[PDB]
Write a protein that binds this DNA or RNA. Structure first.
Lengths: 312, 273, 312, 273
DNA sequence: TTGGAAAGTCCCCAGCGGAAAGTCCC
DNA sequence: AGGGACTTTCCGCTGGGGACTTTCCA
């Protein structure tokens, strides 16, 4: 059967969503494989079919039930928050460079979400999966109901208000959908659309890179309890921990945590804490371990950084 | 009969609160106040005690005191200004419910138009001399007292200004504070590493000031050792006496060069190697 | 010898006891002189000793015979109704800010009292003086009997039932107990505990800060009889008087009262009364006296408020 | 064959009692019942005199008349509703033993469950449409009369409602009343300070309305001059005629904005200066 | 029964910060 | 393009205070 397939997932973290008032063109998606030398971009391929084709890109929520997202896909081949390109008649692989994420304001979330579901039900772009279950009858039929009725405007108003009470503004996902030409030639034949991995806005505190900048002491006794001052990048006092750890023989790992309270986290940029006791307070030779930063919420970590546990 | 400020309003410390913030902003503390004492930003009427009115207005900082876009909110205010009735049998009046409510750089023009329509221009700065950028991080209380001549008919006295008040918003002016120090003791020969977390400072306008009796040095550190405007990682200059036999206490504090400002001292104890 | 002493007594009145359902952090306790700026720090102090020390604070009754109160002391450093702080090895002056009383409900007075006696016999926090006479053998020995016998649970059940048939939930006292470090280093060395003045719930009708909120007239002819409207804080019709007075030459005082009857006491908050005849109806110059309210029941008064008697 | 209330219940006055109170409450008064003669809730069935049954149910005040948590208790009642036979030979029936027992905001849900389990929902409001907050200081009596059509088989008529009953515990609806006033005569220029004691009022929904012939003013007072809902201190407004030569009687009274309700008027005499 | 409370529930206002969101700019 | 910082909302706790409910007593 004729389906759609992602070739290169967007890169999950690091990209920044931009607000309207920030100006245009500030940086392209990024591809999961993208490097500073070899830059890549999201890329999809139409399999089991070769000929003209239409592919559209919409942002969607990252919840359990996929829903349209208030943010808009901006830039190259983008209009009304929708990215639309054509799959050459012979090359069935499509990429998406220079794609930006427009981050809607908090106050304009509802009205911009209502507007997006309407444009999506007029064009017939997966109205059933993203706006509301019983709206799936609005399919891109050379213009799947180019004029919304009054009862359809109400379903929209009820889905908009219901979906805005729980929309994460710091996460989005891409959804590609492919349309193949019908008898008339109008791209109306829809293939199972596919969704991408989730994207996390790099400005969000619960998603900004964790990094240990400096530390006034990278070694310590195995007894632990020693107090260290750590400088870092924006972190949240309530959602952060210092983890020490070392690879074991069996493959497992010894885990050790810094003892510090939310009050020891200075102006989101440093942390006064005390070392944990090592896994062995009686070795005779120092042991090299690792220490790093870790958000509880999502469990991401700073780059493993060297720490030395000498015996006493 | 004139007006003079017995007690001036504190200049820094208090942040203007936005309209969106709460319903009311705290109240301007007085200059004098601190941990242990009560402070009133008062005024004094010389050559008159009796029936009279007082209007506290917001005027710009520098010379062409055009009325300020910001508002004066709290008890007895409206249209961005304070106004009530002077106590007739007293000559000293303090105002303990004055708050400042700034406007957005966006609703700037609409605030200026309300000063005009409500006739709020004490120094009658002209509609023409009114043009220009407004310093939104600083203002000036403008007391406009109205007593009566020996005669009986209302007499408006001269508008008297207070030193400017600054929004504890822009860090180029904020108050200096040392929060923690991973060490307050080190060799006389200096060169000791110290981490120090503090309140927001600018890296190009900050430095560790070690003061002592007729002695004076500075800590060694790069603009780069200034971490996120909140931490300084520096080294301890060498003490005057490099042969110290017994420990000596010395004062260490944050110093902003652009105005000489200094934070509250922290005891540091040099020692002999 | 080594002893414990109160440098600053809690204020006795003006503080409200707080129920569980009301929530946390509504105000800490207080001390004398509560100057305009809030300055009280109640400060005990250990005397003839300078080193590690443990100070505990318990809520006791205001009867002839001291007992544990069912109420809990909550806030900073508190736990299981007890406030435990340490007296620096150098600094022997302890303060107690952010301290609030937790008013237990009438219905849960017995069981809460029973559980407090249990915790005090387990920790050995003065069990003989506060729970029962023949339980003094249970002293805090780094854990004076970490496990209560079945006969000790019977002493507590009998002391509880007996002490609850008569417990004033509207008045309570603080009791500090200092513990010095024994041989092992465990603070089991108990000093003579010292109790504090009494502190009266401000939500008691017979103990709210008696205050004269406003008065339509603050002057009056020496012939008196004149009618005055005065608002005030909760008061009891039958338990209140308006007392006029003035410091005499001989040290004595001229006393005069307001004429009014319980019916004149409007909705607990106001009082319409008639000025009393001044001591000398024929002076030639006005004289200033004082006027206050005053509970008969406990003779507590509001703050002397100036009044001026003028001739006629 | 329909039903109509001949005698509505009194709206305000009676206070609902709790279960922990009087095994017995009181008895709902008619609405024309006085101290001398007492009346009671009375309906009239039009187009039917004969065998049948009647159920009186407690419902919510506003539109979606969901069954109220409150329980109707007394003679012939049960499960929070009243039910008995209709006098087969009379067309008018008054119920002299209706008592309202209010529930606690705590045992709310348990109460709603009992309306459901016992099938008490006269307007068949849906389980879905039943969700929401319930007003516990008011209710309506809902008469569900069941006669028999001409054939002879039971006939359930249309459920009719009575204007809302209100707990004499809801100050948002009690009766305004002025109890004292330390002064009923001031200057016609106004500004006289006046101490007024009253009945429980709401500081945000109350004002002193000085009415006159073709005249109308209000006293000046801040929400904070409303002393514990039982005393208002305010200043008289200036009369229409500022040069008054002869004293003029004026009408002064309590006014609750939200509903235009007015307490009985109290005579006040404006005077020449 | 009826009334008036006291005892137990709620929960707003006001003054401080601290950070998130939303803006600008080197 | 790339990331820092300034200006504009949003939230949370501390301190008390009034007033609405449930329970209690004369």
């Amino acid at each position: 059967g004729p389906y759609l397939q992602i070739l290169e997932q967007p890169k999950q973290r690091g990209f920044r969503f931009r607000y309207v008032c920030e100006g245009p063109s500030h940086g392209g998606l990024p591809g999961a494989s993208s490097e500073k030398n070899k830059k890549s971009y999201p890329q999809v391929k139409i399999c089991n079919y070769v000929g003209p084709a239409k592919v559209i890109v919409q942002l969607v929520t990252n919840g359990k039930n996929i829903h349209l997202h208030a943010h808009s896909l901006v830039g190259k081949h983008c209009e009304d928050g929708v990215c639309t390109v054509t799959a050459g008649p012979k090359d069935m692989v499509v990429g998406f460079a220079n794609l930006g994420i427009l981050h809607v304001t908090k106050k304009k979330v509802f009205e911009t979400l209502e507007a997006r579901m309407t444009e999506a039900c007029i064009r017939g772009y997966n109205p059933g999966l993203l706006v509301h279950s019983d709206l799936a009858y609005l399919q891109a039929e050379g213009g799947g109901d180019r004029q919304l009725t009054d009862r359809e405007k109400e379903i929209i108003r009820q889905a908009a208000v219901q979906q805005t009470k729980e929309m994460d503004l710091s996460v989005v996902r891409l959804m590609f959908t492919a349309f193949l030409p019908d008898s008339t030639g109008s791209f109306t034949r829809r293939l199972e659309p596919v969704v991408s991995d989730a994207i996390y806005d790099s400005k969000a505190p619960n998603a900004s890179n964790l990094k240990i900048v400096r530390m006034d002491r990278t070694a310590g006794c195995v007894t632990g309890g020693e107090e260290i001052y750590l400088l870092c990048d924006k972190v949240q006092k309530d959602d952060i921990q210092i983890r020490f750890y070392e690879e074991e023989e069996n493959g497992g790992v010894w885990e050790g945590f810094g003892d510090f309270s939310p009050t020891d986290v200075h102006r989101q940029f440093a942390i006064v804490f005390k070392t944990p006791k090592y896994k062995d307070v009686n070795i005779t030779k120092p042991a090299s371990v690792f220490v790093q930063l870790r958000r509880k919420s999502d469990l991401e970590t700073s780059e493993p950084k060297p720490f030395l546990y000498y015996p006493e | 009969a004139y007006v003079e400020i017995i007690e001036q309003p504190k200049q820094r410390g208090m942040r203007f609160r936005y309209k969106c913030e709460g319903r009311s902003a705290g109240s301007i503390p007085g200059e004098r106040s601190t941990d242990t004492t009560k402070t009133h930003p008062t005024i004094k009427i010389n050559g008159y005690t009796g029936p009279g009115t007082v209007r506290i207005s917001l005027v710009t900082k520098d010379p062409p005191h055009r009325p300020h876009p910001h508002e004066l909110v709290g008890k007895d205010c409206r249209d961005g200004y304070y106004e009530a009735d002077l106590c007739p049998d007293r000559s000293i009046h303090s105002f303990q419910n004055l708050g400042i409510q700034c406007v957005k750089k966006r609703d700037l023009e609409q605030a200026i138009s309300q000063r005009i329509q409500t006739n709020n221009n004490p120094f009658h700065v002209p509609i023409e001399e009114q043009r220009g950028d407004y310093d939104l991080n600083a203002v000036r209380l403008c007391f406009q007292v109205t007593v009566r001549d020996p005669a009986g008919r209302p007499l408006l006295l001269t508008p008297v200004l207070s030193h400017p008040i600054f929004d504890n918003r822009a860090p180029n002016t904020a108050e200096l504070k040392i929060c923690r120090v991973n060490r307050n003791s080190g060799s006389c020969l200096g060169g000791d590493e110290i981490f120090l977390l503090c309140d927001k400072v600018q890296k190009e306008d900050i430095e560790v000031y070690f003061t002592g009796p007729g002695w004076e040095a500075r800590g060694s550190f790069s603009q780069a050792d200034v971490h996120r405007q909140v931490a300084i990682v520096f080294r301890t200059p060498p003490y005057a006496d490099p042969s110290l036999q017994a420990p000596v206490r010395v004062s260490m504090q944050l110093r902003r060069p652009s105005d000489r400002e200094l934070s509250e001292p922290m005891e540091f104890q040099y020692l002999p190697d």
